[PDB]
Design a protein around this ligand. Structure first.
Ligand SMILES: NS(=O)(=O)c1ccc(CNC(=O)N2CCN(c3cc4c(cc3F)c(=O)c(C(=O)O)cn4C3CC3)CC2)cc1
Ligand SMILES: [Zn+2]
Length: 258
């Protein structure tokens, strides 16, 4: 009886195994655009993905992860609110059963169809397992997805999903350039928060881009054909793998832009 996104094991249950679910810096949150303060002391973010080395794509039973070689400083996030150098380890998405839900963060209570998370860890802690134990261990770049025009840079991800339909399946996923998933503007909101899945560790600097990317209905439909279940098990479509907004408590959301 493990955690998930169903009636019996979803977000409202997680606190029983992971009491930090009710903690002081949980994610995601609603971004109230009128309350977020422009912080002129923030920097432009530095997204350096030219040497990124993607390796593999995995269906882990609650999302799919595109994994990178993080054994050297190849794809890094720096600047913005961050001190030091954060290495890209994986990206994944959260999405809905319908276009009107799926994102984890919300903007003035608006839900997007999906949300991309590019996960990076602070090189001063040496490895990801150590970094998640520190309050400044991870930086997650969040990007909203709306449904409209196709995103060309997503299609290589969409076309491999039939090969990882069920939990535990992986496929080779070399030579994928995550620059093709970015919007035009790097304007962002930032706040201190947590992993949005168990173990819900309070180790994340969140950087959420203001500009959504557009994907096509056909692209998100293929996300919704994935399975939470393993091969040969009763089919449970992988949909609604999002945690709802959590209390902001004693936090300030800062804006990079006027
Ligand atoms: N959204 S966020 O950006 O804030 C964010 C959140 C979270 C992270 C860091 N942790 C993760 O990434 N995890 C959590 C653990 N997870 C699981 C893998 C599982 C199982 C259960 C799991 F929960 C099983 O039960 C299972 C089985 O054999 O039954 C096999 N597998 C592994 C894949 C084969 C894998 C992914 C990073 C970033
Ligand atoms: Zn995530």
């Amino acid at each position: 009886h493990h955690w998930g996104y169903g009636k019996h094991n979803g977000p409202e249950h997680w606190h029983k195994d992971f009491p930090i679910a009710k903690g002081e810096r949980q994610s995601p949150v609603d971004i109230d655009t009128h309350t977020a303060k422009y912080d002129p002391s923030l920097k432009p973010l530095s997204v350096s993905y030219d040497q990124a080395t993607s390796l593999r794509i995995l269906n882990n039973g609650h999302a799919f992860n595109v994994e990178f070689d993080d054994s050297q400083d190849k794809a890094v996030l720096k600047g913005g609110p961050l001190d030091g150098t954060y290495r890209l380890i994986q990206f994944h998405f959260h999405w809905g059963s319908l276009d009107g839900q799926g994102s984890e963060h919300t903007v003035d209570k608006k839900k997007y169809a999906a949300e991309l998370h590019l996960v990076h860890w602070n090189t001063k802690y040496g490895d990801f397992g150590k970094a998640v134990q520190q309050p400044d261990g991870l930086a997650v770049l969040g990007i909203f997805l709306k449904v409209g025009s196709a995103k060309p840079g997503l299609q290589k991800v969409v076309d491999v999903l039939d090969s990882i339909k069920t939990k535990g399946k992986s496929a080779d996923f070399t030579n994928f350039d995550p620059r093709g998933l970015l919007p035009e503007s790097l304007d962002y909101w930032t706040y201190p928060g947590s992993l949005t899945t168990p173990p819900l560790l309070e180790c994340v600097t969140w950087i959420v881009l203001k500009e959504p990317i557009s994907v096509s209905s056909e692209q998100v439909l293929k996300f919704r054909k994935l399975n939470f279940n393993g091969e040969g098990e009763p089919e449970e479509l992988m949909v609604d793998n999002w945690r709802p907004a959590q209390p902001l408590k004693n936090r300030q959301i800062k804006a990079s832009f006027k």
